[PDB]
């Protein structure tokens, strides 16, 4: 039984993400009722906190528990950051995996990644038992305003 906690902290050093988010997030999730191990990750601007619960622990209890503890902790976190609650499943829930390709060239990376994020990602999340439809790869269209310093 696992429940994820993903907090985003933009541009902040990996060591800063730890000292202000990850660490104070793992030490509080340890003393949570029925927590076996709490593995943590401090990436350059990302705080992944994995919480593993002991055997035979009600899945939707371990969830509604993390959330109540994630309240009294939402304060100890920097102003801007917000502790997001992970999806219902795990790495194992990766059932169906596919790729989008157009060999005619009429469509490209971005045209398809958007096709995923705003069409397939919704025509699929409406299916019961499907907790999430994660888009992988491709390119996200970005309005790049390039300033000329001169």
């Amino acid at each position: 039984v696992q429940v994820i906690i993903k907090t985003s902290y933009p541009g902040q050093a990996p060591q800063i993400v730890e000292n202000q988010v990850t660490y104070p997030l793992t030490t509080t999730m340890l003393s949570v009722p029925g927590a076996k191990t709490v593995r943590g990750f401090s990436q350059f601007g990302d705080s992944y906190v994995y919480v593993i619960f002991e055997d035979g622990t009600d899945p939707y209890w371990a969830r509604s528990r993390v959330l109540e503890y994630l309240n009294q902790v939402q304060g100890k976190l920097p102003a801007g950051v917000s502790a997001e609650l992970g999806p219902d499943a795990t790495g194992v829930g990766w059932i169906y995996e596919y790729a989008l390709v157009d060999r005619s060239g009429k469509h490209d990376l971005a045209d398809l990644r958007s096709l995923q994020d705003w069409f397939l990602k919704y025509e699929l999340k409406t299916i019961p038992d499907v907790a999430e439809v994660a888009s992988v790869g491709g390119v996200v269209k970005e309005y790049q305003v390039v300033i000329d310093p001169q």
Binding site: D88, A89, E97, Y98, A99, L109, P128, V130, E132, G138
Partner: peptide, 23 residues
């Protein structure tokens, strides 16, 4: 070639064969 994809995540404890069909 590089392409965009997507993976269906199943709510841990539900039926895989069940969902794959619908999808």
């Amino acid at each position: 070639g590089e392409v965009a994809g997507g993976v269906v995540i199943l709510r841990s404890g539900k039926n895989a064969r069940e969902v794959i069909a619908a999808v």
